[PDB]
Each structure stands twice: as structure tokens, then as C-alpha cells.
Amino acid sequence: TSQVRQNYHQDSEAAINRQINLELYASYVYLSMSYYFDRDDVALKNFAKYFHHQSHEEHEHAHKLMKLQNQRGGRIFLQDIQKPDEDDWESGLNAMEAALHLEKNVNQSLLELHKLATDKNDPHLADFIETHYLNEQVKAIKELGDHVTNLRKMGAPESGLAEYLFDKHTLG
Amino acid sequence: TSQVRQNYHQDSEAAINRQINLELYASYVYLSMSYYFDRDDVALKNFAKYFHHQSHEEHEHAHKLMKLQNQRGGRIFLQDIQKPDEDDWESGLNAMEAALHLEKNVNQSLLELHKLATDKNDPHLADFIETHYLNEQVKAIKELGDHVTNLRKMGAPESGLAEYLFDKHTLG
């Protein structure tokens, strides 16, 4: 047992390791999306930039969790970062919809993690999740929702003009 | 034989003279395109600006080759710069497609030149082509590809609105 370990349940330690992997997975999904929009037959550079930014945001999310694991005296056990479910993301709208779904999945995991922290009477871990993750999730979900709505109302994905104009006026 | 000449095959010297002409030809094509978009019945000033820039880029490509010829002790023999295949470039999309085709043709010539340099064991010439030309070609081809894709997806060439908006939002 670590010299720093105090009030840190083995279940919480395991849950943190799982969340680390999920954040790294989310980062990979966004990296995949970024380079899809970099394709010569897609060519939406601000979509590419947007998802690249999201990829690095997820990387920071993974960082804070790995730091937390060591702070609490838990031990980091990394797992494979699974390849994303798609190679071809179809369109700007589809990518935004897939991102929205991803963020709701990540949020669900974090809410489960918060419940576990509460159940194990770990207020430090509970507050860590609240302070650094829960509102970040809500903000991300709202933003992606907003983006999906605009694209749909503009005529995407059928209208290539819509996706082009959104790339220029919202993501640029 | 020039006092500076060393490891420079007569075939390479001839190939360099041909490439000089091709770069000057490419510059002329782009100049032609530039002024097509300057026409009162076309009036796409950022298309005009874009192709004008490309024309001067090609001029620099010709410069470096003429400099190389003299550096290696070869002798510059200029030929006619042939007029472009078209006087009327039809549309923004058609011009971009024609430019893409042109750049792939120029690239093919450079790849043949590189093969010749390799065959004649001329690593200086081989590296000159690699350093200053091959990636410039790849970058140009990718950019033009990106532009063609956007214009097509936006509804060009039938949509004059598409070409107008692309002129303003991508080339401006």
C-alpha cells in the first residue's frame, strides 16, 4: 500500500483506470475525425481543426486522471486504446452526431464513477469528478447539440453547401 | 566543357532545359486563368488573385532550374512558351480541374527527371528535385484537389452562387 493512500477504495482505483482508457479512446476518435476532414475528397479544414482541438482536450482529461491516480496512491494500469468504430465519418453532420453520442457515453461513465465515489464515501474523488469533469461534459454536449442543430437546419448532410458554410462561419 | 562541370550528364542538362520550359508554360497557363476571372462576364477577383499567385510561383520554379543549370555548368537553351490549351476557362471549377491536371503533368515530368538523375548517379540533381520540387508538387496537387472537392460539393459549376461564395470564403 502506498504511503500516500488514504480513503481510496480499490474499486475507485479500478474505475479511474477504466476512465483513463475511455478519455484516451475519446481522444483517438477525435483524431480520426480530424483527419477524415483533411481528406482531399472531404476538405473541410475547420471541421478538421475543431476535432483536432477536441482530441487534445481529451488528452488533458486523461492527464488529470492519471495525475489523480498517483495523487491518491493508486496505480496506473493502461490498456489498449481501441480504434474508433468508423474509418469513414460520412459527413460533417454525421461526425457531430457521433461526437454527441460519444460525449453522452463518456458522461454516463463519469456519472457512474461519481456514484461509486459517493457510495465509497470518497468526497475528494467525488469533488474531483464534479470540478473537472461533469460541467465540462455538459458544456461539450450542449456545444455539439448546437452544432448538430445548425447543420440540420441548414440542410446537411445532403447540402454540401451547408457543411461548407458552417465550416467557414461557425468553426472558422 | 565548363570549368565547374562535374558528374553532370548531357541527358540531365537536356532534361533540365525541358523542365525550365514546362515551368514557364505552367506560369503562362496560370496567367491566362488569372485574367479569365478578371473578365467583366466572369468577375471572380479572388480566383484571379489565386491563379496570379500560382503564376508567380511557377516563375520561381523556372528560376531555380535556370540557376541550377548554370550552377552545374550546363547551358540554358530556351524554347517557345506555348500558349495554353484554352482561351476560355469556362468556370472556377473547370479552371481548378485544369490546374490539377496541369500539376499532375508537371509532377510526372519531375518524377521522370528524378529517375534520370538516379540512373545517371547524380545525387546532387536527385536531391535538388526532391528538396525544391517533389513536395511542392504534392502540396499543390492536394490544395487543388481540396478546392475541386469544395466547389463540386457546393454545387459548381451550375451554381454561380457556389463559385461566388468559394471565391469569398476560401480564396479571399
Added chain:
Amino acid sequence: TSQVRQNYHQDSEAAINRQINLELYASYVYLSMSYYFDRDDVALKNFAKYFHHQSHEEHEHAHKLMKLQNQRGGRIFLQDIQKPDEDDWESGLNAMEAALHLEKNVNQSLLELHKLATDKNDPHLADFIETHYLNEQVKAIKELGDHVTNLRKMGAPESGLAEYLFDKHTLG
């Protein structure tokens, strides 16, 4: 076939996809190492900083390859990023030795990729590997070699004092 694709063999495209994965793997190994030195029972913060820097360097290596894939009209196919071979990296010296081994493995892959590019007469790809990868590898390998030597001569890994002083005087 992509509109931009020219002189780009399917074998090269596949090799590029494999290299993308290897660079992402290297980034993951370094991230793992970084947080090992962040442990309360290891506590070498400049080792942690050093490997974190290397992790982001590898991330950039992956970026340039993904960009290259799209530049040439190839298609990015991502695979799982495998977890590193170790969870516990033992010591500063062992981590440096493992990094050295990793870099020689990455270098071997790149040399094989260069040979393939040469065999397929793809001088653009050959020069891409030379310009952006081969010397970066040689520099990384030399640096890690230097670090291993210092640590060994100082008395690592048995001497915790040696690893502490190296952390402060070389990596700080």
C-alpha cells in the same frame, strides 16, 4: 482512386498506416513512462517531464504521417494502440534503456519503409522519410545512449542518489 493520387503504391499506403500506428504506440510508451516517474514511490519529476516531452514528439511524428497519407491520396486506417510491455518501468536507467530499444525498433521500421519507397520508385516518399524521420531517429538514439551511459557511470540503478542527481542536473 483519389483525384490526387500519383505514383503512390498500395504497399506504401499500407506501410504508412502501419508506421502511423507505431508512432502512436511510441507516444503511449512514453506517456506510460512519464507517469511511472510521477508515482509517489519513484518521484523523479524531470524524468517524468522528459518522457512526457518525448510522448508529444511521437504524437507529432504520427501527425506528419497522417497528413502525408492524405497528401498522397492514400486512406488512413487506424488500428488499436497497444498498451506498453510494462506497467512498472523499474528505474530511470531501465526506462532509458527501454526507450533506446524502442527508438531502434522505430528506426528499423522507418528504414524498411524507406527501402520500400525506393523499391517502388517513390522519391517523394523516400525524401519524406529522410527529411522528417531518419535524422530525428539518429538524434533520439544518440541522446538516449548518452543518458544511459551517464546513469550507468554514475552508479544507477542501484544508486538512488545517481538517478536523483541525473534528474536534477541533466533532465532539469
Added chain:
Amino acid sequence: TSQVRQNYHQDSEAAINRQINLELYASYVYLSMSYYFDRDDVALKNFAKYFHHQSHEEHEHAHKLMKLQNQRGGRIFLQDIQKPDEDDWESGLNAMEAALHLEKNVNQSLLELHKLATDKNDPHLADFIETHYLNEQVKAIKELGDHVTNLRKMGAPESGLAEYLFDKHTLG
């Protein structure tokens, strides 16, 4: 007929197209001269710089005419840019003499163009030629005359010392 076309004779339109070609030809002659002085067995870098400058001056002359063609609702029809009459320009003095001859030929063409504009009662075209071309010609001819005189009086082309000193003291 162009929506902008007014008082613009078809003969004038044709004459403008011919002048565009002549200006591009002059630019090519000067480019050829520039690189002749860049040869290792000539090596007069300020002669090279001087003619390069003249080449770009001619390029601007062609620009203004192409702009004029579109301004008036005429249509640009480009022709081959003929290679210069010489590959080897012999000496600094000979190049200056050839340039002088070229400029008098270009001037003759412009004076004929002005006469045509007057004959067709096109005062806009007449003034365009006067404002942007006629005095530019007179200035160029005088300058080249001055240069020829100096070189001759100094002992060129027999004196390589004369051409060297002129390169340094007048063109540098």
C-alpha cells in the same frame, strides 16, 4: 458584345492582343539575358540583376495591357511567347545594344498602336498608351543608350576589365 464595351474597335482589340505578346516576348528576352550573365564563364552579377529587373518591368507592361483589354470589354487571346533570337549574348555591351534595339522595336509598335487609337477616335486608348507606355519607352531607350556609350568609351567588349568595372560602378 461585352456589357462594358464602348467605343472600342475590333482592330484596337486585336492590336492590344499583339502588344500583350510583344511585352511578354520582351520579358523573355531580358530573362534570357539575365541568366547569360549568371553563367560561370561570364559572371557579371549586376548585369544579371539589371536584366532580371527589366524582365519584371516588361511583365508589368503586359499586366496593364491585359487589364486594359478586360476593362474595355475586349477579349484576351494569348499566343506563343517566342524564344529570343540568341542563346549566347556575347558580352555586356552586345546585350545592351540588343536591348536598345528591342526597346526601339517595342516603341515602334506602341507608336503604331497610338496611331490606330487616334484613327479610330479612341482617346481613352490613346491616353492609356501615352500615360503608361510612351515615356516609359523613351526613358528605357535613353538609359540603354547611356549604358552602351559608357561601355564603348570604357573599351568594351574587348576589355573584360571595362565590363567588370561597369558592372560594379553603374549596375551595382
Added chain:
Amino acid sequence: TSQVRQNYHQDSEAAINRQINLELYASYVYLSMSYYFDRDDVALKNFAKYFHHQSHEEHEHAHKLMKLQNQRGGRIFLQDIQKPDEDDWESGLNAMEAALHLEKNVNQSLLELHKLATDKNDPHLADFIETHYLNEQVKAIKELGDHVTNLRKMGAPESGLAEYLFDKHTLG
């Protein structure tokens, strides 16, 4: 075998040691030339400055090769730096001609080294030679060629006035 050594043939290592010596020799030749022009009975201080600069350029060439040897895990074995073939360099023109000959000899050695690297499938070494040496050679050879031409055309070496004026107007 060095811990860093990878894909580095013993023949290449030996060739690098030979090239190190040749670069140091070239530096010595230029140092000798520099001080010849410093003599009271020669007194061409800009010739002296020019060759001194070249001497330090060669010193840097030797540096990069010694660095390369260690980078690749080869071992530096230095040899005698042979005294130059002349003590008295006769004239500015003769020194420039001797320098031209020297640079073509150094270039020949580097081209042989490049061929060896290619034959041993060492693309890192091949690119090292291309990037840092081959064009530097071509540039040096062209410059010296230019200088020889000017001096000859001005009347050197018989004309002491020619050498004096060249010292002042080209090398100053």
C-alpha cells in the same frame, strides 16, 4: 559495438574518417592561402579575408562529420593533416584556380561517399551527404568558377591592377 549503432557499415565508418581528414586538409590549404595574401609582397587583404572565411567553412564541414561519426556509433580515427602542395600561391588567380581544383576533388570524394552509402543501403548517411555537403560543393565550385572568370577577363595574373581591383570590388 556501440549501443547506438544501427545500419552503419564498417566501410562507411572508414569513409567518414577519410572525409574528416580531407575537410581538415581543405581548411589547412585555405589557411595557407589566406596568409600568402597577408605577405608584404602580395598585400591583398580581401583575398586574405576570403580564404580565411573558406578555412573556417571547411572547419565546420569537418565538425559535422565528426558529430555524424559519433551520432551513428562509429569511432573517430584522426590522421595527419598534410601540408598543402604549395607554400607560394603565385597570384590571386592561381589561388582561385587551385581552390577550384581542390573543391572538385572534395566533391569527387563526397560523391564516392554517397555512392557507398547507397550501395550499403544507408539512407540516413546518403541524406546527410546530400543535405549538408553536395549543394555546398556545387555552390563553392560555382563561386570559385565565377571568381576565376572575372580575374582572367580583367587581365590577371599579369595585371597586378586587375587583382587589386578584384580584391576591392568583389572580395571587399
Added chain:
Amino acid sequence: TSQVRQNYHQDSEAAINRQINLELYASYVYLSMSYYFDRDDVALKNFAKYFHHQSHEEHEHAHKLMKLQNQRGGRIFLQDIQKPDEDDWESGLNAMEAALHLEKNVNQSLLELHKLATDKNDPHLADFIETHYLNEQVKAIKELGDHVTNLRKMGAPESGLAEYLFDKHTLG
């Protein structure tokens, strides 16, 4: 006999030529030492920097002597720069000890040169040696002595830790 020559004995001229060679030799020894510490299996970069600095100091020593030779109307006759006595310098301490020995040898030569100048009643040469060389020698010898002492007292060469710490705290 040079027009500038006055009170300059042929023996002094010869002695100066010998000293020029010795200073160049010293520069070569230090260059050799510098790159020994650049080896991946030595890796003491501040030792490398220190000896590199000393190498360029010796180069300046050679410069002043070559200048002196010409100032006095003597004639520079260069000889081979002999390779150093060692390829492998063993350790930081051994290199410092070898440098100390070298500097005492150079000093002995200069003291002999001073005696010759005195014997030939050449006060200019005597003062040249005093002003620019004798105290520089004493300073170099003292510094190297100081360095040897520190390394010995710290536990070098057996202690790799000692050499590492000296590299960081004295030479850095």
C-alpha cells in the same frame, strides 16, 4: 630579403615556423579530446565544450604567429599537423592530465623561443612572446592543474559520478 625585414634572424624565422606547427598541433589534440567526450559511451558534453574552446584558443595562438611571421618579413612554411598520440583519452581526468602535459611542452618551446630572441637581440620578438604567450601559458597550466586536482580529490577516474558532477558544476 623582404622590404620590411629588420633585425630578424633566420633562426628566429625558423623557430616561429616550428611554433606555428606546435600551436596547430595543440589545436588538433584539443579537437580530438572534444569529440572523445562527444562519444555515446563517454557523454560528457561540458568536457566536450571545454576542449573545443581550447582548440579554438590554440587556433588563435597559431594566427598571431603567422601574422608575426609576415609582419617581420619572414616566410611561413607550414608542415604536417601530426595526429594526437591517443585516439581514446580514457577519462575526464586523463584528458586533463594530458592537456596539462601538452601545455607544459608548449610552454617549454615558447621559453626556448624567448631565449633565442634574447640571444639574437630581438626585443620585438622577445616582447611578442612575453605579451601574447608566456602568461597565457601560465594561466592555462594553472587552470588545468586546478581541474586535475578537483577531479582527483572527487574520486576520478574510478568514480564516474565524480566526472559527471565536475562536468556539471565546473565546466558547465
